[PDB]
Design a protein around this motif. Structure first.
Motif, PDB file in Angstrom:
ATOM      1  N   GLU A   1     -34.840  27.763   8.755  1.00 36.51           N
ATOM      2  CA  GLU A   1     -33.927  28.248  10.044  1.00 36.51           C
ATOM      3  C   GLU A   1     -33.068  27.125  10.497  1.00 36.51           C
ATOM      4  OE1 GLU A   1     -32.891  30.135  12.322  1.00 36.51           O
ATOM      5  OE2 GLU A   1     -32.226  28.125  13.287  1.00 36.51           O
TER       6      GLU A   1
ATOM      7  N   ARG B   1     -42.436  47.774  12.994  1.00 32.20           N
ATOM      8  CA  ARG B   1     -43.372  47.848  14.101  1.00 32.20           C
ATOM      9  C   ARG B   1     -44.706  47.072  13.842  1.00 32.20           C
ATOM     10  NH1 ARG B   1     -44.137  52.206  18.415  1.00 32.20           N
ATOM     11  NH2 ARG B   1     -42.375  52.807  17.042  1.00 32.20           N
ATOM     12  N   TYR B   2     -45.317  47.368  12.352  1.00 29.64           N
ATOM     13  CA  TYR B   2     -46.665  47.118  12.314  1.00 29.64           C
ATOM     14  C   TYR B   2     -46.658  45.719  11.319  1.00 29.64           C
ATOM     15  CZ  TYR B   2     -49.047  50.977  13.822  1.00 29.64           C
ATOM     16  OH  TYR B   2     -49.453  51.874  14.636  1.00 29.64           O
ATOM     17  N   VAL B   3     -45.630  45.264  10.693  1.00 27.20           N
ATOM     18  CA  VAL B   3     -45.389  43.916  10.137  1.00 27.20           C
ATOM     19  C   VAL B   3     -45.464  43.045  11.317  1.00 27.20           C
ATOM     20  CG1 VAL B   3     -43.945  42.473   9.395  1.00 27.20           C
ATOM     21  CG2 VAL B   3     -45.360  43.855   7.633  1.00 27.20           C
ATOM     22  N   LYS B   4     -44.842  43.327  12.217  1.00 21.98           N
ATOM     23  CA  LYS B   4     -44.679  42.424  13.319  1.00 21.98           C
ATOM     24  C   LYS B   4     -45.971  42.248  14.059  1.00 21.98           C
ATOM     25  CE  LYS B   4     -41.909  41.388  17.267  1.00 21.98           C
ATOM     26  NZ  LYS B   4     -42.662  40.827  18.239  1.00 21.98           N
ATOM     27  N   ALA B   5     -46.588  43.377  14.148  1.00 23.33           N
ATOM     28  CA  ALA B   5     -47.842  43.017  14.887  1.00 23.33           C
ATOM     29  C   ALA B   5     -48.756  42.124  13.951  1.00 23.33           C
ATOM     30  CB  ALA B   5     -48.634  44.188  14.899  1.00 23.33           C
TER      31      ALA B   5
ATOM     32  N   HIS C   1     -62.142  43.033   8.327  1.00 24.75           N
ATOM     33  CA  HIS C   1     -62.176  44.147   9.236  1.00 24.75           C
ATOM     34  C   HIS C   1     -60.687  44.595   9.950  1.00 24.75           C
ATOM     35  CE1 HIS C   1     -64.185  46.729  12.401  1.00 24.75           C
ATOM     36  NE2 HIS C   1     -63.393  46.407  13.165  1.00 24.75           N
TER      37      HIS C   1
ATOM     38  N   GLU D   1     -58.701  48.148   9.997  1.00 24.33           N
ATOM     39  CA  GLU D   1     -58.238  48.957  11.238  1.00 24.33           C
ATOM     40  C   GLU D   1     -56.982  48.990  11.437  1.00 24.33           C
ATOM     41  OE1 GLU D   1     -62.195  48.878  11.608  1.00 24.33           O
ATOM     42  OE2 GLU D   1     -60.543  50.269  12.683  1.00 24.33           O
TER      43      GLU D   1
ATOM     44  N   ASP E   1     -47.594  38.281  13.890  1.00 24.49           N
ATOM     45  CA  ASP E   1     -48.047  37.666  15.091  1.00 24.49           C
ATOM     46  C   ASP E   1     -49.537  37.306  15.380  1.00 24.49           C
ATOM     47  OD1 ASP E   1     -48.063  37.892  18.586  1.00 24.49           O
ATOM     48  OD2 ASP E   1     -49.441  39.174  17.214  1.00 24.49           O
TER      49      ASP E   1
ATOM     50  N   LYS F   1     -40.629  27.867   7.530  1.00 28.63           N
ATOM     51  CA  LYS F   1     -39.876  28.830   7.781  1.00 28.63           C
ATOM     52  C   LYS F   1     -39.149  28.093   9.035  1.00 28.63           C
ATOM     53  CE  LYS F   1     -41.627  32.718   8.754  1.00 28.63           C
ATOM     54  NZ  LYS F   1     -40.641  33.630   8.083  1.00 28.63           N
TER      55      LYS F   1
ATOM     56  N   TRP G   1     -42.645  38.800   4.293  1.00 24.81           N
ATOM     57  CA  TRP G   1     -42.380  37.933   5.711  1.00 24.81           C
ATOM     58  C   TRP G   1     -43.101  36.507   5.540  1.00 24.81           C
ATOM     59  CZ3 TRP G   1     -45.359  35.422   9.119  1.00 24.81           C
ATOM     60  CH2 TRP G   1     -44.679  35.016  10.382  1.00 24.81           C
TER      61      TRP G   1
ATOM     62  N   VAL H   1     -69.244  42.375  14.756  1.00 23.63           N
ATOM     63  CA  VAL H   1     -68.275  41.700  13.929  1.00 23.63           C
ATOM     64  C   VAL H   1     -68.281  40.072  14.119  1.00 23.63           C
ATOM     65  CG1 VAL H   1     -65.759  41.090  13.794  1.00 23.63           C
ATOM     66  CG2 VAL H   1     -66.590  43.753  13.557  1.00 23.63           C
TER      67      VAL H   1
ATOM     68  N   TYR I   1     -54.900  28.989  17.125  1.00 26.00           N
ATOM     69  CA  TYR I   1     -56.235  28.672  17.841  1.00 26.00           C
ATOM     70  C   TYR I   1     -57.132  27.956  16.959  1.00 26.00           C
ATOM     71  CZ  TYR I   1     -60.892  30.023  19.206  1.00 26.00           C
ATOM     72  OH  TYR I   1     -61.996  30.240  19.502  1.00 26.00           O
TER      73      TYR I   1
ATOM     74  N   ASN J   1     -40.516  34.299   3.670  1.00 22.24           N
ATOM     75  CA  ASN J   1     -39.322  34.049   4.413  1.00 22.24           C
ATOM     76  C   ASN J   1     -38.246  34.559   3.109  1.00 22.24           C
ATOM     77  OD1 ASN J   1     -37.481  33.310   6.129  1.00 22.24           O
ATOM     78  ND2 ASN J   1     -37.023  31.572   5.535  1.00 22.24           N
TER      79      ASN J   1
END
Lengths: 163, 221, 320
Positions: free
Chosen positions: A118, A70-74, A9, A13, A77, A114, A49, A1, A85, A52
């Motif tokens: 806030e 759970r998945y959208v938070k993954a 990719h 997954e 992030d 965002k 997300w 990859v 990075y 906002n």
């Protein structure tokens, strides 16, 4: 990859991991829970997300909603951390690109806006932070100075004005 | 939201407060408050038995208050309001129907118990066949009112059109006298006033509903 | 319907680590109970001292999630595998990749090193598994046949040497050398993700949404259906004294005794500060070497560590 297909990719997954996990646990919609539609709702939760906007579709079986969150938070992030990075790369000069520059600009602004939304709403909910004593001190002290500078207050600009 | 009131999904405030920042973070899923009368109707699985006291005699009324709960309960609440006293069976069509339910006796008015013209409930099984079909007179879809009628025989063209709530089970000779009355062939109005004089609701299935509901509320409390 | 089940003292949470920046997908313990390895979806690989609970090291191998790791007891090797289609091996004196076994087609899901034949066995969402020479980057067999992602493998010396459970809801036992299917079991209804081999009873259990099942070697004789922890199960770990641990998907951790299948504890854990409850979950477990303490890597970036309960007696905790 390779850095090209990293995004496509990882997306593949993720979508497939969602499929396995829930659409093997949540069924008893046994035929097909319209998985394809549950994945449409995945995509829409992401979109919201990113923009906002509180996405709140009421009729969802709470465990399914639990999965989706759970998945959208993954994924969000992951998005962020890759933004951190890349921006560090670009500031370190390490490399050039005409995409990973525009892409990172976009991501980084969205993160900023965002943060702002806030911070405004927080100000409204938590009242002016400059209490009242400080306000009165500042105000009065300015007045002392101006008056001690015989400063003629500027007047609203007349119409038939010389200049 | 008590355990009975625990709906099938969440209120969504976790979802909202998560995919947005303008809202305060809440980190516990909270299921909704499901409902009311609709919850009630999950308890009303029993029928309703009313003796109508008309100037011809008594009509025993069976009602699938399990199957047409809103219809039956509107009727039963107008019944324990006795909202049908003085009302007349203002329309009669020979071998078609006898139709009434108006304090105006005009047939063009009336109330729902909530005043709100309520939704039509025709089910796959309720068909206006035979004598004693008790079907809602509505001005069309989901317009239900104080108006109701009994079919004198098989009237299947009223199926998927007129919400049956039950059947006649007593007062066959009462309704026989009713079908023998002359009615004005241009207004179909009974030349003798046939009127609901009184109501006796023997079995109120929504009473037993409310009883069980409130008992569970007391016990979970 | 059974002899009265034995009494195992319960387990209490005592120490909680929070250092990762993603899900913690896998966790393994070093041969000598001095340190444990964690591999996360943050793409890191983090080595931690087992006693001081302090992060001894971190290393940035992969490109995406590390889906599984394993430490060598016959060498200072550490093998990682992740959804980057790649598997790596680290020397842990010089802390560096030393060879990478190319070959799979999609996300590796799990792997194990054979205790005596120096090979790896890795399972992948590409509907296969493979047998790797340790050193020479040689794959001797593509153990094939599962109609979908081979959700896990465990390998052992005795026959059969390789058990793989899948999302095909099947289980398959393979002869290693001919690399051929020997036996199938197909009792399950919903996919099967966790398989575990008893240390001294020549038996093994498999978990799926329905419930656990138990089997006797080498054949696949069903034994004893274990139910009660009705949640997507993710890792089974068994202890010396017959204590058997099922970590579920949604945080609910359940304990039983291996003999009677007696679910004797439910722990229902508390998430970190910032994590919404919906992000709760358990993703892997492992007892230490001395089997006194227990590590669990959860789905909220934390590593929880439970300890045998010392204040437990038959009256403090009766068996029923």
């Amino acid at each position: 990859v390779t850095k090209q297909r990293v995004e496509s990719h990882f997306d593949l997954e993720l979508r497939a991991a969602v499929m396995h996990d829930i659409l093997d646990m949540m069924p008893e919609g046994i035929k097909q829970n319209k998985a394809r539609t549950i994945l449409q709702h995945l995509s829409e939760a992401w979109r919201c997300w990113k923009a906002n906007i509180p996405w709140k579709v009421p009729g969802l079986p709470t465990p399914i909603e639990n999965m989706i969150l759970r998945y959208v938070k993954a994924k969000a992030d992951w998005w962020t951390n890759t933004a951190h990075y890349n921006r560090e790369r670009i500031r370190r000069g390490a490399t050039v690109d005409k995409t990973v520059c525009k892409k990172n600009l976009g991501r980084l602004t969205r993160l900023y806006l965002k943060a702002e939304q806030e911070r405004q709403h927080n100000y409204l909910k938590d009242g002016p932070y400059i209490t009242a004593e400080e306000a009165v001190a500042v105000y009065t002290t300015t007045v002392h100075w101006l008056e001690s500078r015989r400063f003629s207050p500027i007047p609203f600009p007349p119409l038939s004005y010389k200049h | 939201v008590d355990k009975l009131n625990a709906a099938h999904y969440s209120t969504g405030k976790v979802s909202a407060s998560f995919t947005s920042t303008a809202m305060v973070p809440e980190t516990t899923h909270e299921a909704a408050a499901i409902d009311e009368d609709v919850l009630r109707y999950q308890f009303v699985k029993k029928k309703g038995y009313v003796r109508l006291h008309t100037n011809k005699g008594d009509l025993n009324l069976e009602l699938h208050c399990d199957l047409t709960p809103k219809t039956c309960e509107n009727f039963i609440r107008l019944c324990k309001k006795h909202y049908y006293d003085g009302t007349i069976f203002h329309r009669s069509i020979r071998n078609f129907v006898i139709q009434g339910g108006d304090p105006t006796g005009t047939g063009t008015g009336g109330e729902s118990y909530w005043g709100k013209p309520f939704k039509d409930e025709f089910r796959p099984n309720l068909s206006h066949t035979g004598r004693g079909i008790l079907s809602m007179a509505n001005s069309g879809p989901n317009s239900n009112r104080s108006q109701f009628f009994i079919t004198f025989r098989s009237c299947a063209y009223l199926d998927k059109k007129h919400t049956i709530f039950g059947r006649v089970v007593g007062g066959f000779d009462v309704l026989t006298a009713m079908e023998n009355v002359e009615s004005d062939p241009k207004t179909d109005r009974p030349k003798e006033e046939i009127r609901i004089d009184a109501t006796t609701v023997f079995v109120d299935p929504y009473e037993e509903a409310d009883a069980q509901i409130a008992q569970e509320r007391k016990t979970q409390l | 319907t059974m002899p009265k089940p034995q009494w195992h003292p319960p387990w209490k949470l005592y120490r909680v680590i929070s250092g990762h920046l993603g899900w913690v997908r896998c966790i393994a313990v070093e041969p000598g109970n001095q340190w444990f390895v964690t591999g996360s979806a943050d793409r890191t690989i983090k080595i931690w001292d087992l006693a001081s609970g302090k992060l001894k090291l971190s290393l940035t191998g992969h490109i995406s999630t590390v889906r599984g790791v394993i430490v060598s007891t016959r060498s200072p090797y550490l093998f990682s595998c992740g959804e980057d289609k790649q598997v790596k091996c680290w020397d842990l004196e010089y802390n560096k990749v030393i060879r990478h076994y190319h070959g799979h087609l999609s996300a590796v899901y799990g792997l194990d090193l054979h205790p005596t034949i120096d090979v790896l066995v890795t399972c992948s969402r590409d509907s296969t598994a493979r047998i790797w020479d340790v050193r020479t980057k040689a794959s001797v067999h593509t153990l094939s046949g599962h109609t979908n992602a081979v959700a896990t493998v465990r390998c052992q010396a005795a026959e059969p040497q390789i058990i793989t459970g899948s999302h095909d809801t099947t289980i398959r036992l393979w002869d290693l050398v001919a690399g051929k299917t020997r036996v199938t079991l197909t009792n399950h209804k919903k996919s099967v993700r966790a398989v575990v081999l008893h240390p001294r009873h020549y038996t093994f259990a498999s978990g799926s949404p329905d419930n656990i099942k138990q089997w006797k070697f080498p054949d696949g004789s069903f034994i004893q259906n274990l139910s009660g922890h009705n949640a997507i199960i993710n890792t089974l770990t068994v202890n010396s004294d017959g204590v058997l641990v099922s970590g579920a998907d949604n945080g609910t951790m359940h304990l039983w005794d291996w003999r009677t299948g007696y679910n004797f504890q439910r722990v229902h854990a508390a998430v970190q500060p910032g994590s919404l409850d919906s992000e709760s979950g358990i993703f892997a477990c492992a007892f230490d070497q001395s089997e006194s303490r227990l590590l669990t890597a959860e789905a909220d970036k934390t590593i929880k560590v439970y300890r045998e309960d010392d204040t437990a007696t038959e009256e403090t905790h009766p068996v029923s």
